[PDB]
Structure formats: C-alpha cells, structure tokens
C-alpha cells in the first residue's frame, strides 16, 4: 500500500521496506563541483535501434513503457559498465509544478521530470534474478525542462487519455527510445536502489549531464493521469518522486571534464 501521498510517502516505506535507510539509497544530490572527473570511464554505449517495445501501463505510481527483453535487442553497454544490460521498461517522475519533479537533483535544482530508462544484466538471465545482485541494474536517467516540445516524447503524450487509471494498458508496439535521449552522452554516475519500494540496491546510476526539453503541454498531460483505479476517488498523478537521500560517503564520478 506505499504510494506518494501523506499517509503511504516516502516518510513510512522504511516501515515495510527498512532498506529505506539503507547504505546505497536513490536519488541523491550531485554536487557537481565535488564530483570528481574519472578518465578511466568509457563512453556510453547506447544500441536502441533493434527495440520492441510492446506496451504502456498505468501501474498506479507511473506509467510504463514496456519492451520484449528476451533477446538481446536494446542494450546499454560501456560508461562505468562491464556488462551488457538489456532494456526492460522506460517510466518518468514529475511534479504537480514545473519547478519540481526530478528524484535526482544537481548542485540542488530540481527539474520538471526525470526519465528512468531500466536495463537488467544479462549475466543473471532475467530481471528477477538481477534484482537480487548488487549489479544486476543500470538505470540511465535523463532529466527533463520546461521549454520547446520533444518530439520523440509525443507518442507517449497521445497514449496517456488511454491508460488514465491504475491497471489500464494499451498496445505501445513500435516506440524508438532513441527519440527521448539528449545530444550528449556525458553522465555521472554512481551506485545506488530502486527509488521505489522494495528499494533494493541493485542500481548502477547512470545520469546524463544534458536535460531534454519538453514542452509544458507536454508535462500537463502527464499530470492528468490518476493514482487510483477506475471507479475510486480521483487523485492526480502528480508528484511522484522520492526526495534526495544521503550519500553516505559515496562518490559521484563524471565521464566529463
Ligand atoms: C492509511 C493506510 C496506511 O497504510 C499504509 C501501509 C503501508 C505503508 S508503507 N510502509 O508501505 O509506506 C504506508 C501506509
Ligand atoms: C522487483 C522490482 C520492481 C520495481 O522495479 C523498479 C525499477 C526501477 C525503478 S527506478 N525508479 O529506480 O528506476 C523502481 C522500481
Ligand atoms: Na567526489
Ligand atoms: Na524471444
Ligand atoms: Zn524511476
């Protein structure tokens, strides 16, 4: 029953998920002057050409796009990786207000949404299975302002009347992820969890340095979506994201100088 509201936020997941308070928790802050550049981080390697994604779901936290990941169709490779990681689903996390939303922050802004693109390591042979290894995932994030429309996030943006409810699902078949990315590849990157419950901390972050920009058209229709189900009480789907947690100690590297 964890959610985002006052009674079931991130206040009371540690209650059922008591890794909450645990040594490698997500989002955090990236202090960008404090993050050190690493040269012996490679390039990004992103192959999203052979993708199938197959459908989009309103999960009552987010929606989902989701894609077939029994082969080897759309990997992330490279950066701060030494293995291939297979894309399994895309989601977003945005605010109510266009000066809110992110999970990560940098030097502490927020931005209007983050994108988390979700890719397991085929080395434990299913996304289960790498749940349970402390590099069984590689989440690429990629934030998003406020200004002129993205094309490639469109598709998305027409789908959402269909799947406005917790449960709903509709057909997503031929999506190019490679329409949400920036320019640059240039990231930072650091170990972390899932940033919602169970919270396991199985995450490689990867968190590209170059915002997307979106349209506030765009945006507002993410904000129609609802939590709850059909036929319940209407509750925006707004505010979906977990605040920054503490570091502890961890480093932050950059692919760039
Ligand atoms: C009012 C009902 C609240 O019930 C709950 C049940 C579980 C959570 S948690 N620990 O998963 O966030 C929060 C509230
Ligand atoms: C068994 C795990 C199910 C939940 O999977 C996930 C996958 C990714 C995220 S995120 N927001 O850190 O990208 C959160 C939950
Ligand atoms: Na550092
Ligand atoms: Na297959
Ligand atoms: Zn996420």
């Given at each position: 029953?964890?959610?985002?509201?006052?009674?079931?936020?991130?206040?009371?997941?540690?209650?059922?998920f008591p890794i909450?308070?645990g040594e490698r928790?997500?989002?955090?802050?990236?202090?960008?002057?404090?993050?050190?550049?690493?040269?012996?981080?490679?390039?990004?390697?992103?192959?999203?050409?052979?993708?199938?994604?197959?459908?989009?779901?309103?999960?009552?936290?987010?929606?989902?796009?989701?894609?077939?990941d029994?082969?080897?169709?759309?990997?992330?490779?490279?950066?701060?990786?030494?293995g291939?990681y297979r894309?399994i689903?895309?989601?977003?996390?945005?605010?109510?207000?266009?000066?809110?939303?992110?999970?990560?922050?940098?030097?502490?802004?927020?931005?209007?949404?983050?994108?988390?693109?979700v890719h397991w390591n085929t080395k434990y042979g299913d996304f289960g299975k790498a749940v349970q290894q402390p590099d069984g995932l590689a989440v690429?994030?990629?934030?998003?302002?406020?200004?002129?429309?993205?094309?490639?996030?469109?598709?998305?943006?027409?789908?959402?009347?269909?799947?406005?409810?917790?449960?709903?699902?509709?057909?997503?078949?031929?999506?190019?992820?490679?329409?949400?990315?920036?320019?640059?590849?240039?990231?930072?990157?650091?170990p972390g969890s899932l940033?919602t419950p169970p919270l396991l901390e199985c995450v490689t972050?990867?968190?590209?340095?170059?915002?997307?920009?979106?349209?506030?058209?765009?945006?507002?229709?993410?904000?129609?979506?609802?939590?709850?189900?059909?036929?319940?009480?209407?509750?925006?789907?707004?505010?979906?994201?977990?605040?920054?947690?503490?570091?502890?100690?961890?480093?932050?590297?950059?692919?760039?100088?």
């Amino acid at each position: 029953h964890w959610g985002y509201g006052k009674h079931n936020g991130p206040e009371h997941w540690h209650k059922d998920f008591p890794i909450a308070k645990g040594e490698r928790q997500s989002p955090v802050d990236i202090d960008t002057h404090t993050a050190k550049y690493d040269p012996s981080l490679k390039p990004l390697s992103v192959s999203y050409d052979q993708a199938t994604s197959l459908r989009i779901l309103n999960n009552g936290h987010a929606f989902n796009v989701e894609f077939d990941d029994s082969q080897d169709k759309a990997v992330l490779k490279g950066g701060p990786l030494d293995g291939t990681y297979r894309l399994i689903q895309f989601h977003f996390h945005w605010g109510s207000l266009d000066g809110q939303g992110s999970e990560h922050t940098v030097d502490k802004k927020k931005y209007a949404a983050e994108l988390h693109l979700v890719h397991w390591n085929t080395k434990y042979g299913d996304f289960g299975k790498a749940v349970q290894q402390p590099d069984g995932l590689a989440v690429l994030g990629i934030f998003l302002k406020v200004g002129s429309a993205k094309p490639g996030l469109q598709k998305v943006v027409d789908v959402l009347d269909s799947i406005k409810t917790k449960g709903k699902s509709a057909d997503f078949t031929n999506f190019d992820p490679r329409g949400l990315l920036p320019e640059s590849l240039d990231y930072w990157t650091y170990p972390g969890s899932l940033t919602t419950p169970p919270l396991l901390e199985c995450v490689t972050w990867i968190v590209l340095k170059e915002p997307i920009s979106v349209s506030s058209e765009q945006v507002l229709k993410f904000r129609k979506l609802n939590f709850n189900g059909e036929g319940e009480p209407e509750e925006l789907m707004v505010d979906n994201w977990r605040p920054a947690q503490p570091l502890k100690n961890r480093q932050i590297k950059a692919s760039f100088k």
